[PDB]
Amino acid sequence: HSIRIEGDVTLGGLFPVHAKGPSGVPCGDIKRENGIHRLEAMLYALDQINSDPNLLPNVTLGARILDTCSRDTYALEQSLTFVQALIQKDTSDVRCFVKPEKVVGVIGASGSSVSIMVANILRLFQIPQISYASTAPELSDDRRYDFFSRVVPPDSFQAQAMVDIVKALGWNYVSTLASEGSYGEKGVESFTQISKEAGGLCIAQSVRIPQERKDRTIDFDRIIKQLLDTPNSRAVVIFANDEDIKQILAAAKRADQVGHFLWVGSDSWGSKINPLHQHEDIAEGAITIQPKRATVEGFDAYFTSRTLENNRRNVWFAEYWEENFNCKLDRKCTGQERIGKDSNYEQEGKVQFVIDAVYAMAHALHHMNKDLCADYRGVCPEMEQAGGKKLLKYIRNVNFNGSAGTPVMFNKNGDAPGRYDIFQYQTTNTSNPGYRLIGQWTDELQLNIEDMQWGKGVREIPASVCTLPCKPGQRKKTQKGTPCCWTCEPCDGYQYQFDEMTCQHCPYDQRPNENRTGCQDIPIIKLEWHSPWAVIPVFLAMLGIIATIFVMATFIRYNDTPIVRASGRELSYVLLTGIFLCYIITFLMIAKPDVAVCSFRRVFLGLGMCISYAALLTKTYRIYRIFEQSPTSQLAITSSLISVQLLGVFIWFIVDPPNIIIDYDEHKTMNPEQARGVLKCDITDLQIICSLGYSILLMVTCTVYAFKTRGVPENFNEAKYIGFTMYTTCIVWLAFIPIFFGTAQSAEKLYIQTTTLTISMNLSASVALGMLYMPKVYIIIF
């Protein structure tokens, strides 16, 4: 039934001694890997606790060893048997009793469903419980399970270590694989939850492996084809058993895979030689996480020294001896004493866990007994009445060293912290083909990157980033898709990137650079006489300067002879200053100064143009009055119209401020690298037309006046000279208007209008200069 140990204080025990078989019997055949070994470990722990005078010197500690048969209903019945000895009141019956058996705690519930059921049934009665083999993450809520504790870390710490390794090594694409049951699904769920909470990692594949048959070999090909769709995903994680990973490796070897994507192992993989067979080349570089294993020396010596006649408390020891050696009382075995010699058995890794659990329970009980009563030698009556949340609180706050080197402790949730060591398979350069230690994980990730060289190559050879770096000098972030991995697109070349995440438009009126760092147009456009067609007007202006050095040459000496006295002296002085005035005007407009000095240049052609025709205006009126029938009077009338031209530019100054702006915008999208800039002062189309249009009125009157003058028998060469000049200037004035209109639609018209105006002004004066040249050479001959 159940092993009973006498003692004033006892604690329960749950262990899967038997295994469930057919549907009829609850549990059938016995198991040796977890059946008798844990019972013997607990018995040895109780023995060495009773022997040790340091813990509980004057009080002994008992227990009630008991089996669960790996059944939930049987676990319920056994928990009810544990609790009834203290809950039951009486029974009104006589047949024709036993010790009350006051339990204080329970140590067991190796499985998951039985653990949950025992926690649920014992949470109501307020009895503490400590498990050793419960690794399910469901038993991690303090509110759901108040009285529950674990000495083994759950799979959440394993998933945290996996995601930390992935983040440290550098990966973005990972595939999740899980097997049937409540282990792989919970593992992958915790992994996805941690990846979503921490951020920076995403899941690209999620496949499920059913267990409806074992002779299919089709679902494995299907999942390997689903995984082989994206060559970028080179990292996968597995939470299955050894058979599933062996079949996956066999399928990968038989499928002739060339990418050789990496693998991430779980606790089920560990470090064994069985999961590897002929697949050493493809399984190389698989990061596996395995819990730390510690081997004790006392439990083995205790177990190897027990025989049938030595101990009688264990009721399943005889059945274990019969099943181990396959001898029933048609082979009989009597006193072999070869349990540790005939069979090469090895102790399990869970013995230290149950030993640490018993240690923690004993330490908590001793601390509670010491704190409650200290003036009594034996068992004080207060300890019996005091129980419940106090023992749980004392269990939560404990810290000591057990059989293993690492200590045991409980966090706020109640589970032990996770401590793992990372292994890796190397069989190319390392002399030892077995796994080698590369790092540990207790509280912070400590991994040696330079100590691992998988695939006979450099460490950081494989990368899964969803994309290339894509850094050509500009980058843009796209909200489309998952925020895990991003896509880069080339934005417009008229602007640079902002904060390396967007392509915002830089201010206009300049051009951007080539590295997308600045938006400024350093190059400018300036008029050059040599480069543009302005060389001919500049040469024409120089040609006119040579010509005017001849009209005024024969004027300084020929001022008193009785030959020039026929011409008016006042009229001669007017034309002399007018010819020199226009020569300076064409030179000023040719030069383009950036300084605010163009105000003195506009008056050279504005006011200096009327003084040229002023001498011609009164000349025709003087020779016309003698036909119809005071030299100082002719000078005054011309001086008046000069004041009108001088005052005309004055009122324009007070009208609008002479603001000079040198900045210009091409606003041309055909060539983004091109940046055309023109700097002009008072650029107005109507201003230059209205200023030149004023001279058109007086010239039109002089043209009609000179036409009627023709035919007077007064002068022969003089009358013929003035007649031709009145008919030649009208042509260049009439042609100027067509070229002005319908041509300004472009942007290069800022420097072509000056060139044609420079040549037009020179030719209009050369015809007058040539007309004056004829009398000069004539009087020289005569």
Next chain:
Amino acid sequence: HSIRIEGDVTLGGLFPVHAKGPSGVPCGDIKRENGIHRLEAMLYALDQINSDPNLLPNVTLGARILDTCSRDTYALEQSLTFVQALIQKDTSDVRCFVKPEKVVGVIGASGSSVSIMVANILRLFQIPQISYASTAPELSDDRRYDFFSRVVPPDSFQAQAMVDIVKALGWNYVSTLASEGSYGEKGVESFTQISKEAGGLCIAQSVRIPQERKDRTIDFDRIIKQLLDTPNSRAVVIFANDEDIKQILAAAKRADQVGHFLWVGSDSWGSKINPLHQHEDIAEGAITIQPKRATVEGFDAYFTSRTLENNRRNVWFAEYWEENFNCKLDRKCTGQERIGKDSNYEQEGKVQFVIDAVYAMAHALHHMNKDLCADYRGVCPEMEQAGGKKLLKYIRNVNFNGSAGTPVMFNKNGDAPGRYDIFQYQTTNTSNPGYRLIGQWTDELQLNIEDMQWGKGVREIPASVCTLPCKPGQRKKTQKGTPCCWTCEPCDGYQYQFDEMTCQHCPYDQRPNENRTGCQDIPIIKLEWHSPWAVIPVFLAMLGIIATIFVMATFIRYNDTPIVRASGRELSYVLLTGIFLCYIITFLMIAKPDVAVCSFRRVFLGLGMCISYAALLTKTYRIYRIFEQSPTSQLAITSSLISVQLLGVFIWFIVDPPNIIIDYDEHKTMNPEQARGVLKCDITDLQIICSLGYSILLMVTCTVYAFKTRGVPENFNEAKYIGFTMYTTCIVWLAFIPIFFGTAQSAEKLYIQTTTLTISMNLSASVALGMLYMPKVYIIIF
């Protein structure tokens, strides 16, 4: 201990026979309101079930009556007592047994905490449970409590009925009040959750009533002051007990409240006269919800007929008899037989609930037995092995009539549907001062609005809407604040509301209306001669018609006499047509036609002006050539300039299309009601100025040639006449230009320029005909 009844099938029973007292003893004094009455009801139900051959004819039904003492741990132990009889395997001890007592179900757990504990402890063992007094809404989750059922509706249905009544009557302001414990808080939480889920209702006040003392009388004043802050909130709900509402009514009466806000009652209020005292005026019009009460006739006759020696199964009957009559075996009582006579006791409303629960359990068991085996007379062995979810599923699907008229049933969750009747207090005008029925609530709300008036008032006297419905022609929804009540603000008056929820902008060029239904400007502005100052130009045009009726009068007959032959006949024909041409032009411009017919009107003043001055131009040249020294020649030169004016308007039509647009926008925000509209064709200030400027250009060349004409002794009267007109014409032209500049900034300049142009044409033509007709009158008088 516990009452035991022999039977092949038994079901457990939990009842609060005793009540908890001091901390030492679990339960002390007994209670008669729920202690013995429910036990006797269950016993009578079992007796009439065993007597009835319709249900379970060949099989009897037993039970195990038992007490809970209103303790959670005691209830847990007593519930474990039920399951241990089946769970316990054996006991390896001898002293020097009993039937297994296989239980099938349990009926009890009247409280809430004990109900939760029993459900949690029996969910693991898969045992059905039916409660009768558990009204906590926590025991309503099927996933949390699988094996659990209730025959009493929870408070969620009560909150649903309350919110339905509030929505039907019409309210927006409700104040939630709750007492201590786990009843009022859960009620107000369910009410708020239902209000948030359904929508249309909001919570404005949420106060909590502690129970740390009873002699304070300060927190009640504080909460009544907190409730009296907003007079608009006239509806409150209460989930407290009778003492709290009595104290609240007393405080409201002593505070001299004048608003008299309505009240909403809960099941704790019900219909009882004890709480109301001197508060009939303030408690009037309070809606109270009470569960339906049904009185049975068999249980009373059964209880009134039992004595001490009649029944011996009940172990607490003697203690109940001792405590009821206050006699111990210093007063002794022997065979009184006056339990129903000395004490005016009345049966509770929960007897029908336990009777219906036992009925449902028996019906489900009978149906399961009939479906499982029908070829066996007695108890078939299959029924014992089959149990668990099948019995629960059969309990869920049940429908029959119990002791009360209403049937019993279970929904998907497992609780009974809610059936309540609404009461109201009316005393100022009702014939009976007691509560009167006004409506019922079983599945849909059925309330009579006209039935409730509470005297001197309509049923819809109070109003709680959080805002007065604004309907003056303006409405707008503001997202600020809670969606419960809406605030409307006066938007701009230049637009109407869209969808009665926003103030969107109507299209421009049209004013809005007054009711904010349409945005259209029906009124228009048209020129009127009588209304505006255009009467004087119209009278001037009529006065000009009188003048031309005299110039052409003496022209038809005076065409052959040797007196007029001095004047040119060709020139006389030009002035005759020119004077009649301008007379028609001033009339056309005065008229404003809506159709696009002004093209024939613009040529009357554009081309008709040139023919008027054509006769004056050639007249000066004709009289000037005779001074310097072919009548058809002067006719041709004037006919040529007419072709220039005629062809000038032709090329303008080819330049741009003569589109006529009458739509206009005032764009004035000073007066939104005003809508100024002006309709014109080809309204351009430069077009009218350039057309009139053509005559000014030719007039300048004519006046200069007329200066030498003065002083010629040819015709002194004729020469002096022409010189006088010239100065007058240039005067009206010189004043015309400063007019348009600096005056067009307003919007009424569309009809003032036509008036001043009309009088200018008549004045310029009157002086022309005056000097021309001056020599005509010489031959008349002389």
